[PDB]
Structure formats: C-alpha cells, structure tokens
Design a protein around this ligand. Sequence first.
Ligand code: HEM
Ligand SMILES: NC(=[NH2+])NCCC[C@H](N)C(=O)O
Length: 240
Amino acid sequence: ESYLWRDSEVSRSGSGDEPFGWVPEAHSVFTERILAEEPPYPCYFGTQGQQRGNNSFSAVDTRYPDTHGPAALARSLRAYRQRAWQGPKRQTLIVFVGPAVPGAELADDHRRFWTLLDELRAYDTEPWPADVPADPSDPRWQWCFDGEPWFIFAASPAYKDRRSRDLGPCLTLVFQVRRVFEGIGGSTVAGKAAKRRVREGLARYDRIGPHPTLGDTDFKWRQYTLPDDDSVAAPDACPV
Ligand code: HEM
Ligand SMILES: NC(=[NH2+])NCCC[C@H](N)C(=O)O
C-alpha cells in the first residue's frame, strides 16, 4: 500500500506490464547516472547520498492516475517527510513519472511537472506554512507541502545540453526537505566550497554552463524547471 521505497524495495514496485513495471529499470538507469565514474556526476551530494543508502524512491504511473497518481504520491511524500527528518540529514526522494513518453519535448515535461505539483496541493492535509508566502509571484515563494517548504527540481531526458538533469527516460522529480542544506548555507565557507565543487563538475559533464538563476536568491521557482539554454523566465511567471 506504500509506494515509498528504499533501494532494496524498488524491485517490488512492479514486474512486467503492471503499474510501475517500468520503475525498476528507471531506478537502475538513475543509479548508473549518479554513480558513474568518469566524468563523475556533477552533484557529489547526490552521488554520496546514493552510495550511503540515503535516497528513497517513489513513482507516478500516468496510465493509472486514480490509484498510482497524485493521491498516492501525497501519501508517499508525507511518509518521506517523516523519514527525511528522522534519518541522516542529507536524504533525497526521487520520483519517476512514467511510463516514458517517446519524443516528449522539455516544455511538455515541465508542464507535466507543474501540473503534478498543482494536483498535489489538493491532497495536502496541512495548512500552508506561515513563513512562506503563498502567492507564487512573491519573490520568497517556495513550493510547500505537509507543513514546510521543499527544494524540488524536474529532471527529463529532454535535457540535451544540461545533461546533469537527464536522469533517465522519465520525467523525474527530485524532492528534499530544507534540512539537507544545514551546514552549506550560501554565506558559509562550506557552502561556497560546495558550489565550487559542483560547478567544476558541471564543466566536465554538461554542454551548457551553470544557469544564471542558480546565483552568483529570489524566485526559487525558476530553478525548479531550468531551461536547456541561458534563457531566464519572467520572475512573476511561475505556472503554479
Ligand atoms: C539524487 C540526489 C541529487 C541530485 C540528482 C542532484 C542534482 C543536482 C544538479 C543537477 C545540480 C546542478 C544544478 C541544478 O541543475 O539544479 C545540483 C547542484 C547542487 N546540489 Fe544536488 N542533487 C542531489 C542531492 C543533493 C543534496 C542531498 C544536496 C545537499 C545536501 C545537494 C546540494 C547541491 C548543491 C549545493 C548544489 C550546487 C548549487 C549551485 O552551485 O548553485 N544536492 N544537484
Ligand atoms: N539548483 C540546485 N540544485 N540547487 C541546490 C541548492 C538549493 C539552495 N539551497 C536553495 O535553497 O535555493
């Protein structure tokens, strides 16, 4: 009944042409990308999280939206949020949205991403947090669920130049609670070293450099769905 999986549980998601039958292969493709030796995956935090058993997984099967869709993902997210505050600091939930769609464009996957975030709102059982403005045009808006803001981004096979965001054949949502950044705040010595290391890795991996919206940080929504080029979306244009 729970669709929240540790690595060792993903194989039981589905087998053959069943709901989630495509999830085990997506999980393997994801881990291959994140654990690749040369060039290394640019975000060493993600690689380390995978190596240390701190990544959890879920999925949405678009063929079965009423049973394997946003309502179930809301339950999975509530369970993940509990896990994310009890376990190690640096955990990530990776959610595969499938089956894969041959020929989808990046804008299509981004539209699906924002739609899924919108559908999740109806299933949130907690009020919106008082410290985060609820208006998505506010410079300080962040996506919130189950009582707190999250960091979230969309990965897609349609990221041809920003290869670091191609995690396999499906639209893939990467969720973290903000606890993961404790110790690497942007002002911090450690945070500046972290950005150096990741951005050096990006320059060995991607066909386009770090996006300007990553910072040099209002309007975080623009980082959720980076474009594949240097375009910069209008700040008040968040689709939610
Ligand atoms: C599977 C897990 C993860 C994946 C797939 C992942 C992916 C990425 C990617 C693609 C980037 C480049 C920028 C972007 O596209 O947004 C990035 C940057 C970064 N990530 Fe990760 N990440 C993961 C986990 C984590 C965790 C757990 C942390 C914190 C503990 C973290 C901290 C950072 C930092 C500090 C940057 C650099 C941001 C900058 O240079 O402005 N990541 N990550
Ligand atoms: N684009 C990224 N993956 N950024 C990772 C760090 C996010 C940063 N701590 C923030 O809250 O904005």
